[PDB]
Amino acid sequence: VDPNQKVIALTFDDGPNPATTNQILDSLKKYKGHATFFVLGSRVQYYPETLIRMLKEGNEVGNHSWSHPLLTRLSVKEALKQINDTQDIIEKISGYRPTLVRPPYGGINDELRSQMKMDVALWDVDPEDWKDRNKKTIVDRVMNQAGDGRTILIHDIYRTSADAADEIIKKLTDQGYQLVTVSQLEEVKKQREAKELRRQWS
Ligand SMILES: [Zn+2]
């Protein structure tokens, strides 16, 4: 990943759902991009083959809870079990241990942050594809807000979202973006910040 070229992080929440997730994985592979999938533990259990595929093709996997409750409405014990059960099924299938968590609906408090022992991954472009389940609406919202260094929130459980994602992947690739994982984006930003280190010997 070249830090002097454009980068963007496509992130996909609520899968796996083979019919839609596999289409998005195909688009990423066709256009030589990667993304980050925040998966539900219950759906990983239903669709272990899709977890293996997204990892095999170089994508990053994050934790999106077991069954998608608002974690702040639960006891800490129940909420931590949501997260740890999802860590556990991912590890049992793949040997992979996510470091990134996206709490359902973004709901999180300080008590859970300190006990989760994971990095909370947010977003800054949200086309609300669960609300406007319309391919062109999603595409145009994302393409209008896309920019270097931004993180896009899509849900890979809707046909309109998978179709929109193919077009978004194509158009961003056509514009010269590198489609990177969340961790790759963080590393690029560190590489770019490091140019200020050179001030020490200027
Ligand atoms: Zn979700």
Side-chain angles (χ1 to χ4, degrees), residues 1-76 78-96 98-110 112-116 118-121 123-140 142-185 187-202:
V1 181
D2 184 354
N4 297 316
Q5 289 299 328
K6 292 191 298 301
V7 298
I8 193 163
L10 299 175
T11 70
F12 296 97
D13 292 5
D14 293 352
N17 180 45
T20 50
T21 304
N22 281 330
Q23 185 187 322
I24 292 162
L25 290 171
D26 289 347
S27 300
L28 290 164
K29 181 161 60 183
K30 173 180 170 183
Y31 292 103
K32 298 187 174 54
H34 294 118
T36 309
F37 295 81
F38 290 89
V39 298
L40 282 164
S42 61
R43 282 188 162 266
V44 169
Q45 189 173 56
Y46 290 130
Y47 301 120
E49 68 282 348
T50 308
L51 172 64
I52 295 299
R53 184 182 166 201
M54 62 181 59
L55 288 168
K56 188 175 183 186
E57 297 186 0
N59 302 289
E60 182 164 31
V61 175
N63 186 314
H64 196 45
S65 91
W66 183 267
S67 60
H68 213 276
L70 181 59
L71 293 172
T72 56
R73 297 244 312 257
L74 306 175
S75 65
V76 174
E78 287 181 298
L80 284 176
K81 186 172 189 290
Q82 283 278 332
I83 301 304
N84 286 326
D85 285 349
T86 300
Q87 296 295 93
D88 291 348
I89 189 68
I90 293 167
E91 190 173 24
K92 281 177 179 149
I93 295 294
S94 70
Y96 182 100
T99 62
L100 300 172
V101 59
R102 194 167 271 170
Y105 315 105
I108 186 166
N109 58 36
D110 290 334
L112 289 153
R113 280 188 183 270
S114 61
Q115 298 193 40
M116 274 191 304
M118 302 185 71
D119 295 327
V120 173
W123 61 86
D124 42 51
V125 175
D126 182 4
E128 297 178 296
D129 63 326
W130 57 267
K131 186 176 177 180
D132 303 318
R133 305 190 188 176
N134 180 271
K135 176 190 179 190
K136 189 171 186 60
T137 298
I138 299 162
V139 172
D140 289 353
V142 171
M143 297 311 301
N144 181 75
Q145 298 171 54
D148 173 79
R150 291 195 177 127
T151 300
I152 298 163
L153 171 62
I154 302 172
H155 298 83
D156 59 313
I157 57 169
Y158 306 116
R159 176 109 305 285
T160 42
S161 293
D163 288 339
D166 183 76
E167 180 167 349
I168 290 161
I169 290 161
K170 181 181 186 68
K171 286 177 163 180
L172 292 172
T173 300
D174 279 351
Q175 289 188 23
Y177 284 89
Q178 305 167 99
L179 276 50
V180 303
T181 69
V182 167
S183 290
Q184 286 166 356
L185 176 61
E187 177 56 21
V188 166
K189 287 183 175 181
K190 290 180 186 176
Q191 290 177 294
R192 293 172 173 179
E193 295 158 8
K195 73 171 54 61
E196 289 296 326
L197 293 161
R198 301 167 67 89
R199 190 177 175 200
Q200 294 170 282
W201 53 273
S202 64

